[PDB]
Amino acid sequence: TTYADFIASGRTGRRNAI
Amino acid sequence: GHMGNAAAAKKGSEQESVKEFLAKAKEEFLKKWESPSQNTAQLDHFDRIKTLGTGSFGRVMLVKHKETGNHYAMKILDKQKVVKLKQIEHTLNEKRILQAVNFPFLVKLEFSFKDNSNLYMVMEYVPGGEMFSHLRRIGRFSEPHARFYAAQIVLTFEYLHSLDLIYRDLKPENLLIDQQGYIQVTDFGFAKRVKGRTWTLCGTPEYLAPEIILSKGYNKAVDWWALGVLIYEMAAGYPPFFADQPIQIYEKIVSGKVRFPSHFSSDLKDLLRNLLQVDLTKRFGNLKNGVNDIKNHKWFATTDWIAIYQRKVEAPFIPKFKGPGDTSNFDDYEEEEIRVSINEKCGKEFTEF
Numbered sequence: 573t574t575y576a577d578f579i580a581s582g583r584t585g586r587r588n589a590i
Numbered sequence: 591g592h593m594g595n596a597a598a599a600k601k602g603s604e605q606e607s608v609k610e611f612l613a614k615a616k617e618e619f620l621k622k623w624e625s626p627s628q629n630t631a632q633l634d635h636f637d638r639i640k641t642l643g644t645g646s647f648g649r650v651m652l653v654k655h656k657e658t659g660n661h662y663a664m665k666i667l668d669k670q671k672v673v674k675l676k677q678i679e680h681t682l683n684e685k686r687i688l689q690a691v692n693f694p695f696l697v698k699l700e701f702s703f704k705d706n707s708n709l710y711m712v713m714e715y716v717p718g719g720e721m722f723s724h725l726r727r728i729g730r731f732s733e734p735h736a737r738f739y740a741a742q743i744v745l746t747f748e749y750l751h752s753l754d755l756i757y758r759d760l761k762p763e764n765l766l767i768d769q770q771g772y773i774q775v776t777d778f779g780f781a782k783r784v785k786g787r788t789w790t791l792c793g794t795p796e797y798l799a800p801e802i803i804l805s806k807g808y809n810k811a812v813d814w815w816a817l818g819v820l821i822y823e824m825a826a827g828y829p830p831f832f833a834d835q836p837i838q839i840y841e842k843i844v845s846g847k848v849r850f851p852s853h854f855s856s857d858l859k860d861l862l863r864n865l866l867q868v869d870l871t872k873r874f875g876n877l878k879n880g881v882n883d884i885k886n887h888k889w890f891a892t893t894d895w896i897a898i899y900q901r902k903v904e905a906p907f908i909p910k911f912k913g914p915g916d917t918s919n920f921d922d923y924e925e926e927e928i929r930v931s932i933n934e935k936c937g938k939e940f941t942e943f
């Protein structure tokens with residue numbers, strides 16, 4: 573599922589600006 | 591048509607009252623923009639309590655003003671590190687913006703000052719924590735909940751854009767929940783005051799509009815794209831474009847094929863398809879009707895814009911308050927000493943702070 577993909581993405585935590 | 595006489599007159603009048611408000615707001619902003627405040631406190635006026643998190647180019651600490659007992663959130667910027675990262679102008683501009691703007695959902699700069707080593711931006715302490723924390727804790731917000739927050743961002747962007755400010759770092763991590771459950775936008779480290787087009791590649795990957803990624807220039811409509819991303823993430827619990835690595839995120843953004851959870855309402859999907867719109871001749875917030883295409887969209891039909899501005903709407907979530915200076919709504923962070931060199935660093939570069 574999309575949610576499972578999100579959890580597997582490694583980007584569920586805080587995201588810094590570039 | 592969609593509106594009878596009374597409703598059409600009411601909407602027309604409301605839209606004219608926004609114009610009058612924004613005209614006065616710009617007058618007030620420009621006075622402070624042209625004559626910024628400087629050096630309104632010093633470090634030994636404050637007790638350092640605990641690190642609350644980060645902001646662009648620095649770390650944010652909960653502090654207590656010794657003489658009054660009032661708590662604040664103080665961003666500490668190491669001048670040498672700012673120089674090395676080529677962020678001098680950004681940091682000066684963040685403080686200049688913060689001291690000049692005034693809006694109920696923009697965090698206020700209560701004091702600022704500098705010393706031999708660091709710059710200090712002492713902001714209001716917003717004790718409810720990041721929206722990010724609450725969103726990840728409960729998974730996703732209901733549409734009414736997401737809409738309450740979204741309305742505050744719409745009004746805030748309406749205000750900022752009228753001042754020719756582009757915000758450029760909307761995300762749940764930068765939105766703090768205050769004691770009444772309303773949102774406070776933080777971090778103007780990537781904002782820019784410019785009329786028309788600009789080109790800088792900056793922001794947070796998941797929230798970048800296609801035109802930021804691509805070499806073409808862009809305008810304030812990037813913030814309306816980012817609003818689309820935020821609304822989607824609030825309502826879904828995850829953003830519309832993600833991947834393991836930023837480069838792959840950018841490919842998905844530029845492809846632009848948005849898909850929605852089956853629980854999204856039709857009104858929500860319609861709004862999001864008009865915000866997450868690659869074509870700038872079609873993106874809401876960028877058309878002849880401006881912000882009104884957003885404010886008058888069916889998904890916002892229940893939103894009383896003035897009541898949101900006046901903070902008269904009951905918020906969906908009121909954070910717990912354990913007492914003055916409580917940080918229970920925040921993650922714990924590494925505690926870094928504040929060192930102040932006996933030698934002034936980078937004085938000429940930061941004269942204006």
Ligand SMILES: CCCNCCNS(=O)(=O)c1cccc2cnccc12
Binds near residue numbers: 589645650663715717
């Ligand atoms: C990528 C993660 C970004 N986090 C941004 C928020 N950081 S913060 O929570 O230390 C914070 C920052 C600024 C003002 C504050 C005012 N009251 C409280 C906290 C504040």
